[PDB]
Amino acid sequence: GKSYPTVSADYQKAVEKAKKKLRGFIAEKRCAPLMLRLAAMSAGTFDKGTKTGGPFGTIKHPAELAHSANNGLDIAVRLLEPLKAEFPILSYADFYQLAGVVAVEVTGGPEVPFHPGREDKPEPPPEGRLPDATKGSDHLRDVFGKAMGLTDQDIVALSGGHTIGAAHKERSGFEGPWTSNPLIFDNSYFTELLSGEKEGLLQLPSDKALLSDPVFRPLVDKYAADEDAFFADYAEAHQKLSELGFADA
Amino acid sequence: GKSYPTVSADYQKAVEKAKKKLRGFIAEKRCAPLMLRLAAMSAGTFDKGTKTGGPFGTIKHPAELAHSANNGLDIAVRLLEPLKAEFPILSYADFYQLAGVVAVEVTGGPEVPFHPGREDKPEPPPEGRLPDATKGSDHLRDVFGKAMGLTDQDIVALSGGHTIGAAHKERSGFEGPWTSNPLIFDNSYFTELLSGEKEGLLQLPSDKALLSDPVFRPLVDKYAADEDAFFADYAEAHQKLSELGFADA
Ligand code: HEM
Ligand code: HEM
Ligand SMILES: [K+]
Ligand SMILES: [K+]
Numbered sequence: 001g002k003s004y005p006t007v008s009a010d011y012q013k014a015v016e017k018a019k020k021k022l023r024g025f026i027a028e029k030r031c032a033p034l035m036l037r038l039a040a041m042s043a044g045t046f047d048k049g050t051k052t053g054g055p056f057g058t059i060k061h062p063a064e065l066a067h068s069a070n071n072g073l074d075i076a077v078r079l080l081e082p083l084k085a086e087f088p089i090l091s092y093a094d095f096y097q098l099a100g101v102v103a104v105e106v107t108g109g110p111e112v113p114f115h116p117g118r119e120d121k122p123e124p125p126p127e128g129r130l131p132d133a134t135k136g137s138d139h140l141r142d143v144f145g146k147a148m149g150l151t152d153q154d155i156v157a158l159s160g161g162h163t164i165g166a167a168h169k170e171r172s173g174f175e176g177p178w179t180s181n182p183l184i185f186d187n188s189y190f191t192e193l194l195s196g197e198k199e200g201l202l203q204l205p206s207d208k209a210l211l212s213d214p215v216f217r218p219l220v221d222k223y224a225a226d227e228d229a230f231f232a233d234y235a236e237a238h239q240k241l242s243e244l245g246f247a248d249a
Numbered sequence: 250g251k252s253y254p255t256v257s258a259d260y261q262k263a264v265e266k267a268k269k270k271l272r273g274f275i276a277e278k279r280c281a282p283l284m285l286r287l288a289a290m291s292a293g294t295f296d297k298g299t300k301t302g303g304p305f306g307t308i309k310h311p312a313e314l315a316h317s318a319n320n321g322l323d324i325a326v327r328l329l330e331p332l333k334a335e336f337p338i339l340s341y342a343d344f345y346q347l348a349g350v351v352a353v354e355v356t357g358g359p360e361v362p363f364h365p366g367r368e369d370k371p372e373p374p375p376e377g378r379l380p381d382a383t384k385g386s387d388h389l390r391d392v393f394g395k396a397m398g399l400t401d402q403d404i405v406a407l408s409g410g411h412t413i414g415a416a417h418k419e420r421s422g423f424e425g426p427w428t429s430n431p432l433i434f435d436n437s438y439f440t441e442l443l444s445g446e447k448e449g450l451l452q453l454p455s456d457k458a459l460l461s462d463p464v465f466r467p468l469v470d471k472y473a474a475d476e477d478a479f480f481a482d483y484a485e486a487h488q489k490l491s492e493l494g495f496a497d498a
Contacts, residue, residue, distance in 0.1 A: 050299045050300075050301060051299075052299060126375040126377075128375075
């Protein structure tokens, strides 16, 4: 149900050049997880009923923010600002979603389709829309399903975004990587989740909730057994997330 | 542009009986200003663009709240709770707006028309929608005009709600009554505003802003000279406020 806007050839050229620059920058700076989180969090403020929030450039340097546990988003936007300045024609909204797409790609993840044309709108979303790491399956459905409009499949696949990166005690309070290879986009998140707690590795209560739900659990099993299937569902879910409220939502 | 819902005869009977009970209670308890503020603040959270917030029972005992400077709303709902319990058929939304209407009437104000049928909806509005007493004319238009959808005339007339009551240093931080007769609904708010500061009396920066605006100021002058005209415009504005998002907004 999407109808993507037309952008100029010059806009399209800037998207391609920015995509390359983002690859090199993100790879060199080792900041893929931070960038994926920035993109996903920006997009995740969308509420379908009111059609407010979503990936529309509302988070930017200097952030903003406020918003806690969390923290780190401020660093991400500052890191990207010099690069963004090289592409004044691009909206911040597009730039940050493209960074998220690139973050998945340069860590070896699937190639998430990207369509340009998001407009930067004046007011940021209200707070309290982000998921709470201490809560469970009902809460996940409230946030990703009732508010964002994503499916149960999307919830499990997107949770696999935790396959890269780590929590920090000075940010959320949780601490450490979900995986033994936290710069490699793979299905290890699901394998580690299944095998229970392991020293050095993190599981949020929100991750564990996937294990006890009769719909989520079989997907966790599927993804743990089949990385190709995880990649396919992940790319579909990330694309939908990145396009919430855009070109029809 | 209103189409009021049908309510049962029993509902209508409860409205009439509650209205009488509210008169006696509010008069005896000397809480008209607190009740007017409760009604007006509840209604004032409405945002026309998203059709969220408004007078829909979202503030209630035990409050809730949070929301500061402010404070006092908690007292108001607790005060009304035993009376509300005598009218289980009425929505809290209707009950609180009726209390606001009665508050104006028992202090000698105009008779604001009341239509029943507001439904109590699950989620409270987001915060930050209430007006800031330290700000000026542009801010008032942002809040009452852009968000609520009220006119410049409505803004000045409704500001006259300050003709009853007082600020408290432990609540907002401001202190004292706007008028020498703070339980009498009259046009004294405008007279005191015009005459400048007087010992014992309060003026918020938001009140003073009415004086410097080329649209607001002539209305302040008009209301100060003609209480009948103030009453007419006030009743119109209070009715609109009390019905935001209801029966079409
Ligand atoms: C399902 C609900 C989710 C919850 C409760 C949640 C919560 C969290 C928390 C608490 C952190 C730690 C932040 C810190 O301390 O630095 C974090 C980090 C992260 N999140 Fe999630 N998140 C969720 C969904 C997602 C989604 C859908 C994605 C992307 C598809 C994502 C991507 C990431 C990444 C990559 C990190 C690592 C950040 C870094 O390494 O600095 N998360 N998340
Ligand atoms: C125009 C923007 C407005 C601002 C900035 C504002 C601000 C305030 C503040 C700071 C207080 C003092 C609270 C305390 O310390 O106890 C107050 C009280 C009050 N407000 Fe307003 N208000 C506004 C509009 C209105 C409207 C539209 C109404 C009703 C029609 C209203 C009715 C009242 C009443 C009756 C009180 C006295 C409360 C008491 O005596 O406890 N106000 N307001
Ligand atoms: K990994
Ligand atoms: K008065």
